[PDB]
Amino acid sequence: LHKEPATLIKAIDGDTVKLMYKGQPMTFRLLLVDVPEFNEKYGPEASAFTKKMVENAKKIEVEFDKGQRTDKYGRGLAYIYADGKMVNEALVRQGLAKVAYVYKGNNTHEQLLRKAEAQAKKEKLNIWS
Numbered sequence: 158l159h160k161e162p163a164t165l166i167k168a169i170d171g172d173t174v175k176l177m178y179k180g181q182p183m184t185f186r187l188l189l190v191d192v193p194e195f196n197e198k199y200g201p202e203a204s205a206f207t208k209k210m211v212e213n214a215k216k217i218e219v220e221f222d223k224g225q226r227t228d229k230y231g232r233g234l235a236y237i238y239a240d241g242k243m244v245n246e247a248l249v250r251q252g253l254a255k256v257a258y259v260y261k262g263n264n265t266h267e268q269l270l271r272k273a274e275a276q277a278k279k280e281k282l283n284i285w286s
């Protein structure tokens with residue numbers, strides 16, 4: 158896979174962010190994760206976590222997987238990086254997201270994220286507390 162440039166337009170919530178990609182505004186949905194809803198336990202903490210990671214980043218990058226690049230809502234499907242750190246992975250490592258929505262052909266980082274989830278669960282972090 159390849160990292161491509163983007164710039165933050167604005168934080169939205171734990172697993173969606175609005176970025177400028179190839180000069181066009183897009184909502185991106187983070188591949189391979191599910192964050193709780195804002196009104197569910199750890200929803201607000203997941204939003205806050207993603208917000209801080211993307212807002213504090215000097216360099217945002219988008220990495221598409223090998224399959225579908227947009228979902229049925231027109232959201233971009235990607236791995237998002239903040240100064241070389243994957244937001245998708247970081248959410249799961251902190252117990253603020255579950256590995257989820259693992260579709261065949263867009264699952265390159267599945268084992269990386271499952272390892273993060275196993276570490277978060279072992280540490281009883283957040284959703285695993």
Ligand SMILES: Cc1cn([C@H]2C[C@H](OP(=O)(O)O)[C@@H](COP(=O)(O)O)O2)c(=O)[nH]c1=O
Nearest residue numbers: 186187188189190191228229234258260263
């Ligand atoms: C993460 C992801 C979500 N989706 C769709 C499936 C879900 O459909 P439904 O809306 O019909 O439930 C929805 C979940 O996203 P959210 O968790 O943002 O709601 O997004 C994909 O099609 N591909 C994906 O990779």
